[PDB]
RNA sequence: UAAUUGCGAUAACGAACGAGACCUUAACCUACUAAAUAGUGGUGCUAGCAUUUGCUGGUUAUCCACUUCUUAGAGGGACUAUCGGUUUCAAGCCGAUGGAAGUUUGAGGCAAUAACAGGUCUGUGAUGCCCUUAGACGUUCUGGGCCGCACGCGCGCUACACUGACGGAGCCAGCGAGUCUAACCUUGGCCGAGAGGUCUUGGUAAUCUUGUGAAACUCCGUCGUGCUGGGGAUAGAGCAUUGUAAUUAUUGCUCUUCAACGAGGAAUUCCUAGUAAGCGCAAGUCAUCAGCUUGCGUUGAUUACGUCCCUGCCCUUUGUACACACC
């Protein structure tokens, strides 16, 4: 398409918010491997950035991908909408948050094990290991292993 | 299979048995023919009734038939 | 001067009348029908006659109650049902002869309409024939 | 990423000096004989037949259909 | 030549479609012929179409079948895998590209070339459950030929880059060339091959 | 592969367990005054011709 | 003169032409201007349930069908004779509403 | 040369009028653009974020040229497609009213479309004006 | 022959039921009747383009004429018609032509005699007997359960991808249902990212919802063969709707999480043409809840036109130590 040589511009796999992140994947699918952003959170996060979709995450620049980390982190300050985010009015302050690290994992433990302090049946059903969204357990799920 | 049942075999037994200086070897007429000389109650029935009439005719010309 | 054509469910409405060629199909020309790759199935009935070989008639055809297949078959059996309509009763019974003797040797249902129906369904499976599985054990 | 997604320079001259030894280019045909990946085969092809060496025959979209300039 | 014009305006590229050598909307047909004698009456190039969806009934008597055009026959045998069935329209664009990259690479008349690869598929040599050797039909030969074909360009197609279009291409150019590399052609010799050991 | 195609004369019947094998009289192409019976799996009929990798070889019926 | 329309509905076919050709003879008796007896579509009521008043045995299923015919003719006719040609339709099974 | 909107069917007269409002400098764009998927049946925004509101808008104001009066909910039917509920079968979901109306509000606007008098939004004079030049424009432009 | 269908044969003759006939429906009918509850042309009015009068358009009280499309009454039409071939000797069968349609024209509805200890006493204010009948086994109310999960089985939905997913754009059905003592089907406007909310409107319906602007499909693009942008299970958070009440999540929506699954053993099902398969839609249940069913249409193959091998069925002959009848 044009001169793309960058002989000592392009970069492999990277780093990125403690997740490790493939340079070769279009930056939008390639940024959807960190646990909290997928397909939507990317793409509107990677246009709210200014950024082109259109080149791989790897050439990206090594400013773009800190202005992509900065409205990740702080989606509500760069007009993302509320609704947009996976942890609104979270349980304990109200504010809404989009848990973006290794840390959407502690974020359900916590509501896991707040579920399994308060003795709620959802949390005894987590402790126990069983469906909990009031699925049919005679048939399915058998095995999980 | 278009095998003719008794009830269209005997009518038009009694059409050519009765009705042999009368219609032709041919089904458009031998139709409209039995429309007037005989009451079948339906309008498949008649046709079918016409059309084994017409083939008793065209057997007829060649040679009688038995019965 | 009016005529139709249908093959399963769509019905297009064919008004052939004095004109200078011009072949609609739902108020667009006729390159336009656009299934894309069913469109010689509708230039079928002018490329067999006579590829122009008519500035004296307007096709005006109004395709509607089926599918996209359905739809150009049934423009595709309206024109060449109209052209021949047309020509039985102003031109000549010689050339409608002639044309409908072209569009029968070549007849995909141009003239006759395709006398396929669906077939009711039946309780006891999906589908005119097929049943449920059927289990033993 | 398992091949060809971006840098293709390093024998760069295999977009120009490929017209020969096949009639068929295609985006199927740019990934498999080692050149490019099918991210960009596409635009690869677009580019150069805008300006280069491949006229088309069917253009249609999820294929490709080209040959060789005469 | 003669391009005349009425108020709808058709471009000359179809205004020139029979008033010289018919042909196809792109490929002869007056120039096929088939490779031997034993499936004439069974490949049906000639009479000519414009496109691979005459949509006729082919079902309802025995042999009605084989005058079915064989570039439709083709197109039928791609409409499968279950989830394709239906999308007549989708195989015969596959078609017309397969047709297309045929003439592109040794173009040898794509029809003529499609002809040729059934002629050199259809399995001459069969084995009946009795493990005995039978003798195979020449209807059943261009159905077994056209089967093995389009299978053959499913599985090749199935799980890879390259497209089914050029799948079939491929195939149908090495088993019109006759060569041990195509799915059809192997199958074929595998059946002759264990038909013999059955006489 | 030696060469030798043939033509039904005549369609005899159905043969095989399940009756999908037919036995045809065949008569060759070349050297037309000499015929013999086959056993063909798809559908055959009259004047119809054949292709026999084997040349002579009398099909009987099949059990 | 005031116009009205008659909308004859039945189920039984019949009688519904019984109803609607005596309509359209006593309006021609009585000279007046007619829009020709409308027939709209016969909705068919069909109604699918199970044979089995229990669960066993093959699924059967049977389709009950109540095929109801309607008809409407509008015309202009005086006040007398308008109530004598809907007080001359009193056919039973056949219910019919003059609207102004 | 008599030319209509009739002429050109589904994606040069579209695109080359979704071009001329692009270049008309207008933008009608809420702000919602980037953010917004269209309809619940769908699965990912435009893939165009810049350009798919101004291919809705030319597919809307063609859509109203070609027949009466169009509203908001038919509008919706018509643009939304089936969607991917999971491990259960398919079904028709109509499309995002609120792109749907405010794109109908943004022709109004700029005198493509009008009310009707008997309820939705019509095809305008200037809107026939308009649609038709840019049909012949794509004609003469593309053969 | 599909047929105990017929030719015929003949200690039977003449009949009855069943089959067929019949009825419904799906095909055609430039023929009849008739249509601002269906539609078509041209005049009015009339926006665009083109301007020598032409293309496409709106004009729902804007006229006139007509019924090709549509509708529904009365009818017509097919009777394997005609012509060949072949049948013992016919009944018939096989080809071709014509035909809208030639397999009972396609699909059904109805469907005999004898039976089953087949299911249903949980449809019945059908019902005998037995039991119970005031601390009720009656009835009602609250709450729970019917869904509960080491596991085995049956019907299914979604998939494993490029014959694809995603995004735009193209923009095509048929069968139906719908509220007056009242809350049903909802167009249109507005608000909302969505689900949804709100203000009106039309419809008791060929009139309005609705052309149900369905989905598959088509075109142009992005993806690029990787458990990947296939798949969407599980789960977290939030927003709504129904409902007196959603916790054991009714459902819908948004974001996030992204499991198995790389085409499936032995076995086994359904199916021969507008059929299989794919695709959705309406209706039933229904306040809400489809992955179900009953129908409907859209796209539409491959294979066969046979056989009795398997599993069975019909007739005849034959053997039987079987009659609760080879379990
Ligand atoms: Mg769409
Ligand atoms: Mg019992
Ligand atoms: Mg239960
Ligand atoms: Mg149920
Ligand atoms: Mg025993």
New interface residues.
Partial sequence: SLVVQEQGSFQHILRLLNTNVDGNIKIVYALTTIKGVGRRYSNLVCKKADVDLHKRAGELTQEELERIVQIMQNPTHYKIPAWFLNRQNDITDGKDYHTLANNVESKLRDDLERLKKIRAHRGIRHFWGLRVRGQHTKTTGRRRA | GRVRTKTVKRASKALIERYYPKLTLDFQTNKRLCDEIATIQSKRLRNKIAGYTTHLMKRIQKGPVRG | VQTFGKKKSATAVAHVKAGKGLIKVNGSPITLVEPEILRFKVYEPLLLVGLDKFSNIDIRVRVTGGGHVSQVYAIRQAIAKGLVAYHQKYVDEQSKNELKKAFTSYDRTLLIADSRRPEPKKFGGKGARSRFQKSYR | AQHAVILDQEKYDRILKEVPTYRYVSVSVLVDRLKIGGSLARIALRHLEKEGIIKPISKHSKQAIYTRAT | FTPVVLATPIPEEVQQAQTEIKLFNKWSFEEVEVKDASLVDYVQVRQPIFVAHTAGRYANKRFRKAQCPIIERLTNSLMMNGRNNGKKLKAVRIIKHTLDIINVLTDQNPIQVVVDAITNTGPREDTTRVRQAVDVSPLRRVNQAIALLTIGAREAAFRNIKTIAETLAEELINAAKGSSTSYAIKKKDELERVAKSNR | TPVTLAKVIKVLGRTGSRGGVTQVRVEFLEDTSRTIVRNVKGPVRENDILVLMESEREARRLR | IIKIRITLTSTKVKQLENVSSNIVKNAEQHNLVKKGPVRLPTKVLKISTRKTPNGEGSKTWETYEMRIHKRYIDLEAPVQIVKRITQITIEPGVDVEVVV | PGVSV?????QDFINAYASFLQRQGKLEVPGYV??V?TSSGN???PQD?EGWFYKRAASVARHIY?RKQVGVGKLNKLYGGAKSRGVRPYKHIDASGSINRKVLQALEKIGIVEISPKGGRRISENGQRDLDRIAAQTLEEDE
């Fill in positions: 009739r002429d050109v069917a589904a980037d953010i998927k699965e990912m925004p974020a070609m």
